[PDB]
Design an enzyme around this catalytic site. Structure first.
Site, PDB file in Angstrom:
ATOM      1  N   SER A 106       0.778  -1.236   0.000  1.00  0.00           N
ATOM      2  CA  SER A 106       0.000   0.000   0.000  1.00  0.00           C
ATOM      3  C   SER A 106       0.809   1.286   0.000  1.00  0.00           C
ATOM      4  CB  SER A 106      -0.899   0.051   1.225  1.00  0.00           C
ATOM      5  OG  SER A 106      -1.912  -0.867   1.084  1.00  0.00           O
TER       6      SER A 106
HETATM    7  C1  LIG Z   1      -1.705  -2.229   1.497  1.00  0.00           C
HETATM    8  O1  LIG Z   1      -0.554  -2.611   1.594  1.00  0.00           O
HETATM    9  C2  LIG Z   1      -2.918  -3.117   1.735  1.00  0.00           C
HETATM   10  N1  LIG Z   1      -2.652  -4.557   1.722  1.00  0.00           N
HETATM   11  C3  LIG Z   1      -2.283  -5.209   0.619  1.00  0.00           C
HETATM   12  O2  LIG Z   1      -2.576  -4.805  -0.483  1.00  0.00           O
HETATM   13  C4  LIG Z   1      -1.534  -6.446   0.690  1.00  0.00           C
HETATM   14  N2  LIG Z   1      -1.876  -7.307   1.541  1.00  0.00           N
HETATM   15  O3  LIG Z   1      -2.841  -7.142   2.354  1.00  0.00           O
HETATM   16  C5  LIG Z   1      -2.934  -8.011   3.517  1.00  0.00           C
HETATM   17  C6  LIG Z   1      -4.071  -7.621   4.504  1.00  0.00           C
HETATM   18  O4  LIG Z   1      -3.729  -6.499   5.358  1.00  0.00           O
HETATM   19  C7  LIG Z   1      -4.448  -6.018   6.459  1.00  0.00           C
HETATM   20  C8  LIG Z   1      -5.440  -6.764   7.096  1.00  0.00           C
HETATM   21  C9  LIG Z   1      -6.123  -6.246   8.218  1.00  0.00           C
HETATM   22  C10 LIG Z   1      -5.858  -4.978   8.749  1.00  0.00           C
HETATM   23  C11 LIG Z   1      -6.638  -4.457   9.949  1.00  0.00           C
HETATM   24  N3  LIG Z   1      -7.060  -5.308  10.807  1.00  0.00           N
HETATM   25  N4  LIG Z   1      -6.900  -3.125  10.088  1.00  0.00           N
HETATM   26  C12 LIG Z   1      -7.709  -2.524  11.167  1.00  0.00           C
HETATM   27  C13 LIG Z   1      -8.551  -1.351  10.638  1.00  0.00           C
HETATM   28  C14 LIG Z   1      -9.216  -0.553  11.760  1.00  0.00           C
HETATM   29  C15 LIG Z   1      -8.235  -0.218  12.876  1.00  0.00           C
HETATM   30  N5  LIG Z   1      -7.607  -1.431  13.419  1.00  0.00           N
HETATM   31  C16 LIG Z   1      -6.842  -2.092  12.359  1.00  0.00           C
HETATM   32  C17 LIG Z   1      -4.861  -4.233   8.119  1.00  0.00           C
HETATM   33  C18 LIG Z   1      -4.174  -4.750   7.003  1.00  0.00           C
HETATM   34  C19 LIG Z   1      -2.950  -9.493   3.105  1.00  0.00           C
HETATM   35  O5  LIG Z   1      -1.962  -9.991   2.481  1.00  0.00           O
HETATM   36  O6  LIG Z   1      -3.949 -10.207   3.385  1.00  0.00           O
HETATM   37  C20 LIG Z   1      -0.393  -6.719  -0.211  1.00  0.00           C
HETATM   38  C21 LIG Z   1      -0.003  -5.870  -1.240  1.00  0.00           C
HETATM   39  S1  LIG Z   1       1.388  -6.581  -2.022  1.00  0.00           S
HETATM   40  C22 LIG Z   1       1.392  -7.931  -0.983  1.00  0.00           C
HETATM   41  N6  LIG Z   1       2.381  -8.991  -1.095  1.00  0.00           N
HETATM   42  N7  LIG Z   1       0.387  -7.846  -0.075  1.00  0.00           N
HETATM   43  C23 LIG Z   1      -3.718  -2.714   2.980  1.00  0.00           C
HETATM   44  C24 LIG Z   1      -4.662  -3.889   3.191  1.00  0.00           C
HETATM   45  C25 LIG Z   1      -4.627  -1.542   2.672  1.00  0.00           C
HETATM   46  N8  LIG Z   1      -2.883  -2.469   4.223  1.00  0.00           N
HETATM   47  O7  LIG Z   1      -2.695  -1.188   4.718  1.00  0.00           O
HETATM   48  S2  LIG Z   1      -2.457  -0.841   6.246  1.00  0.00           S
HETATM   49  O8  LIG Z   1      -2.220   0.628   6.396  1.00  0.00           O
HETATM   50  O9  LIG Z   1      -1.348  -1.640   6.895  1.00  0.00           O
HETATM   51  O10 LIG Z   1      -3.714  -1.009   7.041  1.00  0.00           O
END
Ligand SMILES: *C(=O)[C@@H](NC(=O)/C(=N\O[C@@H](COc1ccc(C(=N)N[C@@H]2CCCNC2)cc1)C(=O)O)c1csc(N)n1)C(C)(C)NOS(=O)(=O)O
Length: 403
Positions: A141
Site C-alpha cells: 500500500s
Molecule cells: C496495502 O498494503 C494493503 N494490503 C495489501 O494490499 C496487501 N496485503 O494485504 C494483507 C491484509 O492487510 C491487512 C489486514 C487487516 C488490517 C486491519 N485489521 N486493520 C484494522 C482497521 C481498523 C483499525 N484497526 C486495524 C490491516 C491490514 C494481506 O496480504 O492479506 C499486499 C499488497 S502486495 C502484498 N504482497 N500484499 C492494505 C490492506 C490496505 N494495508 O494497509 S495498512 O495501512 O497496513 O492497514
C-alpha cells in the site's frame, strides 16, 4: 596509515587506535549501532564490508579521512527504536532509512538484528547483509500516493471526487478493502488505504501510467551508493498486462523494492516532485536533482497523506505532538521459497515530516512480525512517530501543528 571514518559533524565511526605500541588496530565507537553501513577490516587493514570496503583505497593513500552523511545522534535513535521494535514484535529483521529531503543525504541507515564489528567472531556471513539495500520486498500500500498523483495528472480524477469503493471482481480474482465502504474520496482512499479505490484508478489508465510514475520516483533504478550487495529490486518490464495485474499494481503487487529505494521515493514526495540522488558522504549544497512530477500535484497528495496520521487513518499511532506529518502505511504478504504467498508479513510505515514543509523522509520496514499484530498501522506506525519525533526535536524543527 589508515584513514578515519566520521559522521557528518566529525564524530568517530571508524578509528585506527594504537594497541601494543606502534602496531595499530581498528575501533568502531558506535559498534552495533552503525555496523552494517560501516563494515569492518581484517588484520591487514583491508576493507571487507560496508564503507570500510567501498572506500578502502581512499582510506589508505593510493591517506584521507571520510565524512559520511550520517548524523550519529539520529543514527543512534533510529537504531534504538528499530532494534527494540524487532524484539518487541519478535520479527525476523527490521530496517529503517532516514533521508534528507533537500539533499538526498542519508542521515541514518539501520537494521536489526546487527553485529558488533569490534568482535565479529562467531557472527555468520548473514547478519552482515545490509537489509536496507539487500532485502527486496513488495512495497504494498505504500505506492498508493503515487497512484493518486498519476490519476490527478492524467485527468482521470479531480481533487474533490467521490469514488465508488464497493467490492467487485476483475476476471476471477476479487478486490476488497479491509473495511467495506460504499464510497470514498481521494483523501479517504489514502486514509483508509482502499485497495478498491486505487484499483479503480489503475484500470482507467494505460498500464504504462503507473510504470512511468513509479520509475520517475526511482523504483527499479539503482541507488549507486557503491555498497556491497546493493540490490536494484525486481521491476516489471511487461509488454502486455492483464486487468488483474494493472489493478493489483496500484497496491504493491508485481514489483520488489529495497528499503533504500522506498526511502528515495518519499524523499521525492517530500521534495514535491524533485528527484535527487542518494549519498552516504557529506555533500556540498546545492543538489539540484531533476523535476519528475508537477509540484502542485505532489503538494495536493502530501496534504492527503496527513489524514493517515490523523484520527481515522491507518497510521494514527504514528502521530507526533506539535507536528504535522504526511505518512503512508503498508502491509505486504511475504513470498515463500516456492514463489507463492505464505502467512508472513512485511509491515511498513513511510512518510515525510513536517507536512508544512517536509525536511526528512523516513522508512520503517519490519520483516515477519509475529506477536499479536502483523500490519504496519499497529506494528511500524508507532515506531515511525518515535523515530521521527526524536529526529524533529534533535534537529530543532519548529513545531508545526497546534496540538
Ligand atoms: C496495502 O498494503 C494493503 N494490503 C495489501 O494490499 C496487501 N496485503 O494485504 C494483507 C491484509 O492487510 C491487512 C489486514 C487487516 C488490517 C486491519 N485489521 N486493520 C484494522 C482497521 C481498523 C483499525 N484497526 C486495524 C490491516 C491490514 C494481506 O496480504 O492479506 C499486499 C499488497 S502486495 C502484498 N504482497 N500484499 C492494505 C490492506 C490496505 N494495508 O494497509 S495498512 O495501512 O497496513 O492497514
Amino acid at each position: 596509515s589508515r584513514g578515519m571514518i566520521t559522521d557528518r559533524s566529525g564524530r568517530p565511526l571508524a578509528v585506527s587506535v594504537p594497541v601494543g605500541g606502534g602496531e595499530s588496530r581498528r575501533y568502531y565507537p558506535s559498534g552495533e549501532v552503525t555496523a552494517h553501513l560501516i563494515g569492518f577490516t581484517n588484520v591487514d587493514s583491508q576493507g571487507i564490508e560496508g564503507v570500510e570496503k567501498s572506500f578502502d583505497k581512499w582510506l589508505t593513500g593510493q591517506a584521507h579521512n571520510l565524512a559520511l552523511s550520517i548524523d550519529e545522534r539520529l543514527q543512534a535513535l533510529v537504531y534504538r527504536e528499530l532494534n527494540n521494535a524487532v524484539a518487541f514484535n519478535k520479527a525476523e529483521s527490521g530496517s529503517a532509512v532516514l533521508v534528507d529531503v533537500n539533499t538526498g543525504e542519508v542521515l541514518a541507515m539501520a537494521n536489526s538484528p546487527s553485529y558488533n564489528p569490534n568482535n565479529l567472531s562467531g557472527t555468520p556471513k548473514e547478519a552482515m547483509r545490509n537489509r536496507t539495500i539487500t532485502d527486496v520486498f513488495e512495497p504494498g500500500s505504500t505506492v498508493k500516493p503515487m497512484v493518486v498523483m498519476t490519476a490527478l495528472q492524467r485527468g482521470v480524477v479531480r481533487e474533490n471526487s467521490v469514488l465508488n469503493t464497493i467490492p467487485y471482481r476483475i476476471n476471477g480474482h476479487e478486490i476488497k478493502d479491509v473495511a467495506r465502504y460504499s464510497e470514498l474520496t481521494l483523501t479517504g482512499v489514502l486514509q483508509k488505504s482502499s485497495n478498491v479505490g486505487v484499483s479503480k484508478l489503475a484500470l482507467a489508465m494505460p498500464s504504462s501510467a503507473l510504470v512511468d510514475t513509479y520509475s520517475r520516483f526511482g523504483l527499479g533504478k539503482a541507488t549507486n551508493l557503491g555498497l556491497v550487495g546493493e540490490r536494484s529490486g525486481l521491476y516489471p518490464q511487461k509488454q502486455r498486462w492483464s486487468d488483474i495485474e494493472r489493478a493489483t499494481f496500484s497496491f504493491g503487487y508485481g514489483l520488489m523494492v529495497t528499503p533504500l529505494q522506498l526511502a528515495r521515493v518519499y524523499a521525492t514526495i517530500g521534495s514535491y516532485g524533485i528527484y535527487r540522488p542518494l549519498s552516504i558522504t557529506k555533500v556540498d549544497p546545492p543538489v539540484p536533482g531533476e523535476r519528475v512530477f508537477p509540484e502542485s500535484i505532489v503538494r495536493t497528495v502530501v496534504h492527503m497523506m496527513e489524514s493517515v496520521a490523523l484520527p481515522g487513518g491507518g497510521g494514527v499511532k504514528a502521530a507526533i505532538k506539535g507536528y504535522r506529518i504526511a505518512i503512508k502505511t503498508g502491509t505486504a504478504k511475504k513470498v515463500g521459497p516456492d514463489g507463492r504467498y505464505i502467512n508472513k508479513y512485511i509491515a511498513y510505515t513511510a512518510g515525510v515530516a513536517p507536512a508544512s514543509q517536509p525536511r526528512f523522509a523516513l522508512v520503517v520496514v519490519i520483516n515477519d512480525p509475529q506477536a499479536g499484530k502483523y500490519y504496519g498501522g499497529a506494528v511500524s506506525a508507532p515506531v515511525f512517530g518515535a523515530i521521527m519525533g526524536g529526529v524533529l526535536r534533535t534537529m530543532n524543527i519548529e513545531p508545526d501543528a497546534l496540538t
